[PDB]
Amino acid sequence: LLRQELSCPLCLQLFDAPVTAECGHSFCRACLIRVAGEPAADGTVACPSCQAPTRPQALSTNLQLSRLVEHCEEHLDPLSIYCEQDRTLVCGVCASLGSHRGHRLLPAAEAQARLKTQLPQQKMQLQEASMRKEKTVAVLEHQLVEVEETVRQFRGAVGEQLGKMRMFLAALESSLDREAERVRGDAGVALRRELSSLNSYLEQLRQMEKVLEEVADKPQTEFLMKFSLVTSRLQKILSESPPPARLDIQLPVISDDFKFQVWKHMFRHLMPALEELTFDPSSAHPSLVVSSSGRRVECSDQKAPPAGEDTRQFDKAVAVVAQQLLSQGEHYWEVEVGDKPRWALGVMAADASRRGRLHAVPSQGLWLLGLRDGKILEAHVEAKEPRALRTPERPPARIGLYLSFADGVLAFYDASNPDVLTPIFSFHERLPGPVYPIFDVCWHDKGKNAQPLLLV
Amino acid sequence: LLRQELSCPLCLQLFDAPVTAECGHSFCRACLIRVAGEPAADGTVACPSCQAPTRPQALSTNLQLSRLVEHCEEHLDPLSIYCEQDRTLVCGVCASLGSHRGHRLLPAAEAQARLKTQLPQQKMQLQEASMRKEKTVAVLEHQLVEVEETVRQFRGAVGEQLGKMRMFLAALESSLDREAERVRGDAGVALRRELSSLNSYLEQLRQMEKVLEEVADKPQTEFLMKFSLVTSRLQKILSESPPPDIQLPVISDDFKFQVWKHMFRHLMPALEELTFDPSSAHPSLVVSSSGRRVECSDQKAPPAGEDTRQFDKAVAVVAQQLLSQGEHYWEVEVGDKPRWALGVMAADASRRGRLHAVPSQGLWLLGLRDGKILEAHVEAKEPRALRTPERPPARIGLYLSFADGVLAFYDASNPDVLTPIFSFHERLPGPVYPIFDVCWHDKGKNAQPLLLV
Ligand SMILES: [Zn+2]
Ligand SMILES: [Zn+2]
Ligand SMILES: [Zn+2]
Ligand SMILES: [Zn+2]
Ligand SMILES: [Zn+2]
Ligand SMILES: [Zn+2]
Ligand SMILES: [Zn+2]
């Protein structure tokens, strides 16, 4: 093992006084010194091999292998043959004795000729190992940068999740403390108006008391003069007898009901940017009259003219789609429905045969929903039969809708109060998209389906 | 026909030079120039009775008798006769001429004798006016203190309303970014260990290349030495052939909802480490663990006593303490309990007599029997129920605020978050007591141990 366990990959010197580390390794001194990079100034001097460090300040000087050691230094006979059964080089005397008296072999000259011939193949394996190690280096850089930049995206989402409600709270507190401060200004004006009034009154009253104290002993003429003057002024200020009442504030004060309604108002007012970039009539229909930037809809008393047959347009399906749709991000918009007693909403891809709303259900991804007669829901869902819902204790007025993607986050909830929305139903599952959601209003229907339909 | 401008009715002093201004009033200047309170030292422009735009240099004056005279002295006849149709006292010439040739009057003496008699009565009226002025000053101070203390309460509610979610967001971001930093540390440990490995590999590869470059032209002995050494080490490293992914739960797209869910939990109102009260305790509800955890067994119970603070038949529990301001939150578990009851009552109803005691007298009820048959009653014939959700119910949450009667108790099928399924709506003067009851064993299975906090 002079060349098997006593083979330093760095030195192959005359091994004596090996340095032992807490990793469980024995090695040489300058051989290990040849490794550069990490001095104790930058930190640990860990073993690059076995995940167990050892500082140069924890010397456990153990020379066990150096004392286990004992041309050739044993026979003056140079190393002679590499064993072909043991796969080991020894010297002729040291080989025949001990190790290699009983194996199969190949002669030394032939073996070294084989090696001197095969040299470039091992060099190619060397540069191939270098190529693989650099492939792994590139994987390392790509993985580390992808991780830290995904962290960049996550911390940015954190930043925006902060910013939404942070700016909301700042704006609400500022608005309402300025409201309170303007009430302060009004009350201050009132109190200083009464201040000026009553301050003039009492100041001149005490002036009057001192003046009468002086005038109590004047001759009869000016005596009566001042008497008449004071009589007139006192009768005037008693005619100006103001019957005063208190103020009776009705300022909305911080109770402990606010939390619910204010928290709904923020739950609504969480809203990213504008979606006032309108629709596409690419499959529009006859029976409707539109206005208000082409947005408010109804029907009128003019029979509707038919349309020539076209491939994309429906046979009769009187519905509407829009223009924009993405496959990333978030979007919001707001509508109202008025007194409309029957309508329908759903969504469809490029796959269905648009001409004909015959038997066609979300079984093929032809997603449906509708309602008749005020509140009578008809939920055609992944079952050929509709379902119903609540009859709420108040009529529904507006609608508001929002889209997020990764979960197929579809959102459409009533907004009968612009301060606060009220949920109706959702389906927490994913849709690939973007295909279009489509929305339908029925015909004139004798004028019964002819009452206005709002939007902004 | 007011003669009020004999002098200024608000100054009663020397030369005035009356101002005819756009306020609709006749003004002086020294009246409030010598005296502060409505001063020009800060830019005041208001009338103490109208508050109209007016400046002190719009003079349109009269100096008739001021230039004439230097006692009436318009005739060298002092004021002589008081007039009664107009309540004026003038001199014979100035009265009879013009003003007072045709009125009711008092010539000489009775009126001024009345005045000399009534002097102290008008002084007493002056004391009354002083008392009224002090009433108005006290109203001023009361308004000042109410205003500044309303500012106190509003700014304090603002501070705490900030602090709750401000500390919540800070804590959540800190916890999760430190979690991210620890994931960074893990990735750093992996990359630096592989760094040490591969840098040692390439460094000793460079050593091998330089050694072979130097030594490729040496004698055969050390040649064969190197041959065997490299053979052994290279077959060792080919045996050491490495045969080579974070699953971090990322934010969802509905993620905003769950973040709001956890905030809805950790809103952090006051803590209620104050459990039930055995002020009317009974046998079959054994309590332990600082009066928290309760059980019961198959040994019959001593019969009922009779006193003030004890129930009719209900072997049940009442509460110790309750105030009239603030908020109180808690989270509960029910185990496999299929039947129980909770409610609230005032100091008026009797705890004796198990007849149909109902919220008809404001004795508000809620209960459950037989697995999931909910029974929540108000003044009617039968208690009501609701949809029975599918995912198994585990835990409960409850909340109280006082001034608005904010009563709350909602499902918490995951203790992280509650979901509103059933509660009532009333404001109570209070504080009236919450009471709690568990029914019998029914072979043991109707009575299983109970917990809170
Ligand atoms: Zn060495
Ligand atoms: Zn030998
Ligand atoms: Zn051998
Ligand atoms: Zn004056
Ligand atoms: Zn005025
Ligand atoms: Zn006269
Ligand atoms: Zn008269």
Author numbering:
A (entry chain B): 7 to 76, 85 to 470
B (entry chain A): 7 to 76, 85 to 258, 262 to 470
Publication passage describing the model:
Tripartite motif-containing protein (TRIM)72 (mitsugumin 53; MG53) has been determined to rapidly nucleate vesicles at the site of membrane damage, but the underlying molecular mechanisms remain poorly understood. Here we present the structure of Mus musculus TRIM72, a complete model of a TRIM E3 ubiquitin ligase. TRIM72 is a member of the class IV TRIM proteins, which is the largest subtype among the 11 groups of TRIM proteins. Its domain organization includes an RBCC domain followed by a PRY motif associated with a SPRY domain identified in splA kinase and ryanodine receptors (PRYSPRY) domain.
After introducing point mutations and deletions, we were finally able to resolve molecular models of mouse TRIM72, including RING-deleted (ΔRING, 2.75 Å; the highest resolution is in parentheses), full-length (FL, 4.6 Å) and wild-type (WT, 7.1 Å) TRIM72. At the N terminus, a catalytic RING exists in a bent conformation near the other protomer of the CCD. In our crystal structures of TRIM72, the key residue Gln57 in the RING domain was observed near Arg207′ in the CCD through the bent RING conformation. We also observed that the electron density map of the RING domain appears in only one of the four crystal structures of TRIM72 FL, suggesting that the RING domain is intrinsically flexible. Based on the experimental SAXS profiles, the calculated models showed that the RING domain is highly dynamic and does not prefer the bent conformation. Additionally, an AlphaFold58 prediction suggested that TRIM72 has the extended conformation of the RING domain, similar to one of the models calculated by SREFLEX. Therefore, we conclude that the RING domain is highly flexible in both the TRIM72 dimer and oligomer on the phospholipid membrane. Next to the RING domain, the B-box domains are located at each end of the CCDs and contact the H1 and H2′ helices of the CCDs in a hydrophobic manner.
